[PDB]
Nucleic acid binder design. Sequence first.
RNA 1: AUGACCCACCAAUCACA
RNA 2: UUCGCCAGAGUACUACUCGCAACUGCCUAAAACUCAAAGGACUUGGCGGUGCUUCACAUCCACCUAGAGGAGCCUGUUCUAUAAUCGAUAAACCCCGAUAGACCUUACCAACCCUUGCCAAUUCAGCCUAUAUACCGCCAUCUUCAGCAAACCCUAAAAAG
Lengths: 63, 51, 132, 343, 109
Amino acid sequence: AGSRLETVGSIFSRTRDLIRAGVLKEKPLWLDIYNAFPPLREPVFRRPRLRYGKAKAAVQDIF
Amino acid sequence: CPICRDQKLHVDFRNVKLLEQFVCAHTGIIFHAPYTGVCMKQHKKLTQAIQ
Amino acid sequence: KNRAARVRVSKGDKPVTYEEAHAPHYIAHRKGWLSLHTGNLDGEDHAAERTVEDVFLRKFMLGTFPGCLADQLVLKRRANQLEICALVLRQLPPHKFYFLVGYSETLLSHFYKCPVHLHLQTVPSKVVYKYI
Amino acid sequence: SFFTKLTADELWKGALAESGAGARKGRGKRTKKKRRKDLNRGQIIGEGRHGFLWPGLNIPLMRNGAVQTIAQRSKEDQEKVEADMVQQREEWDRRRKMKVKRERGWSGNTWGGVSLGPPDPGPNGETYDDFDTRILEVRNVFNMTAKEGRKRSVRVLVAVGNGKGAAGFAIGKATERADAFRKAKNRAVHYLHYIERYEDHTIYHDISLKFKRTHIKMKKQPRGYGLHCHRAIMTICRLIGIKDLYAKVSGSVNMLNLTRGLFLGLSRQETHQQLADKKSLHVVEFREECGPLPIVVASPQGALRKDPEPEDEVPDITLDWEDVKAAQGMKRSVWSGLKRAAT
Amino acid sequence: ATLNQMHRLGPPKHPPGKMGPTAGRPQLKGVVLRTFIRKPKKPNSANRKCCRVRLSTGREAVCFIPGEGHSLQEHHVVLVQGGRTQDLPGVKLTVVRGKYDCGHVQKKK
RNA sequence: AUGACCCACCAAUCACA
RNA sequence: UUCGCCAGAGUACUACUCGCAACUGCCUAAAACUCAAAGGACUUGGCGGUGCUUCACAUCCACCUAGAGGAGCCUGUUCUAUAAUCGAUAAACCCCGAUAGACCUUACCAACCCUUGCCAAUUCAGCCUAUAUACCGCCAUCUUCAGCAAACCCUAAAAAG
Ligand SMILES: [Mg+2]
Ligand SMILES: [Mg+2]
Ligand SMILES: [Mg+2]
Ligand SMILES: [Mg+2]
Ligand SMILES: [Mg+2]
Ligand SMILES: [Mg+2]
Ligand SMILES: [Mg+2]
Ligand SMILES: [Mg+2]
Ligand SMILES: [Mg+2]
Ligand SMILES: [Mg+2]
Ligand SMILES: [Mg+2]
Ligand SMILES: [Mg+2]
Ligand SMILES: [Mg+2]
Ligand SMILES: [Mg+2]
Ligand SMILES: [Mg+2]
Ligand SMILES: [Mg+2]
Ligand SMILES: [Mg+2]
Ligand SMILES: [Mg+2]
Ligand SMILES: [Mg+2]
Ligand SMILES: [Mg+2]
Ligand SMILES: [Mg+2]
Ligand SMILES: [Mg+2]
Ligand SMILES: [Mg+2]
Ligand SMILES: [Mg+2]
Ligand SMILES: [Mg+2]
Ligand SMILES: [Mg+2]
Ligand SMILES: [Zn+2]
């Protein structure tokens, strides 16, 4: 059918790959459009860990 | 066995198409009897034949 | 729990006739009477006779037309004649149906000593009211 | 005594005793079995053992263009007819007592390893006949209910794949075994992974993963060395299309954690092209059977480095004492060398 | 442990097999002192025919008689072997049927 | 205050030539 | 980077040792034998002489009215009793199967009788014999309680919610 794993890859990844495997027999619109002008970052899932220890953020205060 | 259930199978040195099945393709070694499942008699027969 | 003349709820696949889907407390409210005769009225006689006759007719008909009876029989009694009316699955060739019509009507006429009519209504498959 | 009798349905319902309280709490054993046989199966309208022939029923209405009269068969003719009917019963008993063969998965009474056959077509008409499904684990599972007390659900864990690199697993649970099978199939097709296969037989590189309490450790084999693995992993591999592999599972062998762990692991493979690109170098493969000849597997599309990799005299890598023990011939277990059947 | 501690203990060594009722021999020969009966443990019940034997090692021990029916009197010599009977607590030996004075079980006549 | 023991889920169809 | 510890459960903070101002002691610490588990965390139930809210409408307390439990009878149980039925037998039995036993009913007891012995046919009729823990049929009960359940979907895994 498709792949409902949100965590495994980008939608791009899963889609292209599922086509590659010959499972998904029709290319979806947004695919060609995607290939043409892809986003800046791969939209792959990531877990938001809380920082610990001495670590802090990098954000510069504006003065 | 595979070999002795079908009596029309003959183990000779001559049919290579049969013997070929009992050798590895890549490694060129003869399968041991359990891998295939032939009975020890025919496995020995085969080994000699392939020789 | 009252169990009388009920068809219990199954997993939800069970085909159920209009008749079978209505518990006794619905008689004369939603479903009607499978028989009609004068006997049970206030000032009237021989209820018992007609009851036995009825029972025998249901049994007899059920055995005479094996497998082809759709719903329970309808027995109308009018001025000494009984019209039996049945819902029948199409199973037999019309030869067998007419054979059994004639055979029955004559047989029962000579048994109960009154003219007996038989009316067959034919149906593709059991009419389904509910679930399924 | 004619009024005293009943319908067949009533009598069978009576005799079978499926609706009793014995069946519900499992108050009786499963080796005790009785069945219902239709008693109208072989009978024809008009047929009786008195031997009559009725114009509309047993025999055609018209013979030679005239109306056949009511007539009766000869004694021996009825003998033959009853012989026929008896032989029919015996034939149906011969058909009934023959039990169809069940292809055995892992063991005879295990459902594990068994094929369910292709999942069902999706609502869009989309059809997978290319997919097979194998059962990994079927389990009777219970829950304590206010009214019923113990309540028994089956839950099955299943995997599908086309052999071409797309496989996935899912779990499904229901009161009836049949029902859970259906559920887990149709659900599996929704979570598919793509497994990158090197040269379409092995994985790309060695994998070691600790998923929860399960450690899988897999090693990449050459072409001839078929599928040496936990039996579940062999099943899943056969579904993916991975033909040559070695995997040792340690810690808890719990089935769901094993297949989750496995898919996680295989998903996270880093292809030779990916490696080529992130390092920006040629990745070159030295076969042993091909000698010193440098087969170039992957080249970094884009700009290649002119910078060599820092040469580390001695690498710092995590080593597994198992592999080291294997390399030096300190694994003496009588269970390891054993000859097994083909993959 | 650490590498020092593992150096200091040596590698782990497999403890020798502790020895059982037959003292590591496959059978023993012994004379019958008494024939009696023992009930099994709780979940499942019968009354099991056992004897007491004295064994060539001089040790005296309860032993169990397989099969249905038997003829055994005091002073009969039997040959006993190692299988432990699961019901009977304490009974670790079994008479060998078909040797010396314990004959094979006679088929019903 | 008390209330022998024992109780449970491991088998597969029908129909046609 | 180290050191100290840990190889199923019991037996066992025990028996024997060595040492100790300890002499019913501390420390160190087994085995026979017994078991096929022992453990850890969770889940849904059920339960709680646990807490907090909200209730009870003939209903628990507060309260109203008429009765039962004491008498005679009537009728049913239990016992005891008889040669002399059976069934119900906490709530959910006890003027209950019975809107009905002098013979019949009737199943019981005692004497006697009859053996293709209700029917078109049948090496067969017949059985108020045993099993309600094999059952259908009818029901009781929680209950004037609000839930049961197919088909799906979701959950860094799913027992279940
Ligand atoms: Mg088997
Ligand atoms: Mg037992
Ligand atoms: Mg034994
Ligand atoms: Mg001898
Ligand atoms: Mg007491
Ligand atoms: Mg108790
Ligand atoms: Mg350990
Ligand atoms: Mg111990
Ligand atoms: Mg202490
Ligand atoms: Mg002490
Ligand atoms: Mg000591
Ligand atoms: Mg009151
Ligand atoms: Mg009064
Ligand atoms: Mg009073
Ligand atoms: Mg009184
Ligand atoms: Mg009584
Ligand atoms: Mg009785
Ligand atoms: Mg009683
Ligand atoms: Mg009760
Ligand atoms: Mg009387
Ligand atoms: Mg009398
Ligand atoms: Mg009698
Ligand atoms: Mg009951
Ligand atoms: Mg509702
Ligand atoms: Mg969770
Ligand atoms: Mg749910
Ligand atoms: Zn052979």
